[PDB]
Design a protein around this nucleic acid. Sequence first.
RNA 1: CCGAUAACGAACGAGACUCUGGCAUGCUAACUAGUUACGCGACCCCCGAGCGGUCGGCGUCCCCCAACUUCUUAGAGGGACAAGUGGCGUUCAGCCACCCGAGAUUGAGCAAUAACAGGUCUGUGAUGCCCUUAGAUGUCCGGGGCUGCACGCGCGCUACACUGACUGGCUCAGCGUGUGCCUACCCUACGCCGGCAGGCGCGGGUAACCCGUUGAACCCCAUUCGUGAUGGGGAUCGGGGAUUGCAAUUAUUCCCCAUGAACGAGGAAUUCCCAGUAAGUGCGGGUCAUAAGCUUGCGUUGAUUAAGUCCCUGCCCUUUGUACACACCGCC
Lengths: 189, 64, 135, 56
Amino acid sequence: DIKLFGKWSTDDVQINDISLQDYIAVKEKYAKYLPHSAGRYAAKRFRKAQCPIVERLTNSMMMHGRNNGKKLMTVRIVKHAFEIIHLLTGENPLQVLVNAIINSGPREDSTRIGRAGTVRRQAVDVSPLRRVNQAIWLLCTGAREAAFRNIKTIAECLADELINAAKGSSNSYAIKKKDELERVAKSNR
Amino acid sequence: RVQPIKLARVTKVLGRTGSQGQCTQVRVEFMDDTSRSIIRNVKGPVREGDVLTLLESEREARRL
Amino acid sequence: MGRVRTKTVKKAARVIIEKYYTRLGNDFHTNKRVCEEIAIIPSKKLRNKIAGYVTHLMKRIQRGPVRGISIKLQEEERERRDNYVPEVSALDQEIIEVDPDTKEMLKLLDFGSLSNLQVTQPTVGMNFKTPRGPV
Amino acid sequence: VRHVLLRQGVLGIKVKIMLPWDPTGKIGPKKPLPDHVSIVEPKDEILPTTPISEQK
RNA sequence: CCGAUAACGAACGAGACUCUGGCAUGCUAACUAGUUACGCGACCCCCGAGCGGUCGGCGUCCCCCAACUUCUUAGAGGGACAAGUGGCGUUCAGCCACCCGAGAUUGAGCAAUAACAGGUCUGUGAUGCCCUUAGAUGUCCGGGGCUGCACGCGCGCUACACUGACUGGCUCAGCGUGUGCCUACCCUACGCCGGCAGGCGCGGGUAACCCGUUGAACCCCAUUCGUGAUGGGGAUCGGGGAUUGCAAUUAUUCCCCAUGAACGAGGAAUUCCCAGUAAGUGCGGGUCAUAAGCUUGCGUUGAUUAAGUCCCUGCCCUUUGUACACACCGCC
Ligand SMILES: [Mg+2]
């Protein structure tokens, strides 16, 4: 009924694991016509959980100095990327994004201060909110270094980054970084 | 041979640790055996009632 | 956080409560409407802060005797103190359980052989004192 | 703030006077201090007797 | 702050306070602010609408020849108090969550005792003392210098590009300034010429009356480019044209055509920052005969992360040790 960007109904999108279903916000209560709403989502802690993840991706995709207010450009980038992934795969772009987020969130990490063995002294599992944040950050970063110095534009780079991450193919920078973090944490157990 | 990943829900949040506050230590209750509950340190923002994956079951329990 | 009231508001609240307990109530807006005439407040923010603390203290007063003085509370306390002597004294027992040592003391005092004394059986064992140290 | 040209140099004088509060205002400020709170004294108004009706 | 209590009663600082921002279809008020309505028009549909649509076109404080204050302005007031609910708490002081609300922590200003051999005698007709005072260290005039370059460092601006550059079109601000005692130097509409920088006439404004509805930039929508030191970058440098001034050389600044250098995201290190914030982006003021890569403000777009800790760097309170007291940059 809401049809983000005029299509791609949100009701058929399914979150495959209960770990992040309280933090992914594609459901009908958070279904928005357009990923642009100055909703004051950073005013209080945990308020970004009820912010739609399309808005989260739009907010994260505008980085590296040149791009800090160009949210309209980021929205058009997201729209073109969703068009591209719909053509390339045939399924819901929001479903592709949700699968990419779930497969990109690193399940555990390592952090400490002192005489670290390999990277950090202890291996630490992460929270679902940190999972979503890190996944979105990794996807946008992978798209950015994919699109920096080649003719392939940022729309296609984001699109195929999400496509590769949604399945899991080691061709996406997000899950390459995720696997590196998994190895580091497993060694630092 | 490796232990499968298993889910567990945060019941009570013990408090920050790691000496920089970078980790919060919580008490977490397993899905399969609700009577089973351990203490785990997790990084990132955590509020009680949310569920999270355990790649390995028992790592470290230490009251603050 | 950072909502702790200060001496100015607390002292003003206590003074006006002990001066105008009858007129004040538990409604914040009525209590902030009485302050403009029962007191001279240089600031509106100060006035309504004082009124809020007055409401809090009066809720505490109606639930119990806060240290703020109150005429009804004091007259109730005075009634409960300088009255309620029982119709029978607490010191006119028909019999008094009395120790043989005390009976000997009364005999030496010449108040021995009183009909209201019943001599108790002396205890045996001498097991007073707490065990010394821990354990 | 004033300067005194003494033989040894310059001597600085700073005088601060806290003016008293007065409603008249010709010796000090009319407005009271912001944190000063003054309360009027209530009357007796006991009324301990039987109800009456006074015709007037 | 509640409380304990050989203390009692006070005083400063904090807070309170002032300015600012957010709400008031509640009050007052508006031809130097408007809105609505009406009436003249102008244009489209006129198949047929017709109380159809647009007008920053013209009028209704021209004085009888409409009202009203939402929008703008600025005054008086209100409004928010941890007040209401739940929980925690000695059920005190308070803390957390939620409802209703514009708002449940808007930012500043002021800011104690004591001190530093901290900075200024180049702000002063503030000033002690010393120096000089007619071949002047006074003062004025001319020229030069303060810019000078094998080099090192700090604050910044521009970039390394396609989340882009170029070309065109469309569409949006808010602070705030504007003709001068001496003192000459204002902000500029419109018309004409020039390709541009500019020039020439005609006005307006000592200002909610004019610039000005401040048609700003980024952004948006289309075009070309195509992963190359390229249409990225615009340093260096040549020739020419204007402006200010008494004077432009060691180029004041501006304009046009040429050259297109390093630079392909930056070692060890290191700064700033929690919400309309960072950052991108332009516009005012100060300086100004000429002028901003500076600074002080303003708006526009607008986030990632965090609601924690004492790990580093520090600060506050208590206990403790001291051979320190110029106080650990000590002492020895
Ligand atoms: Mg070019």
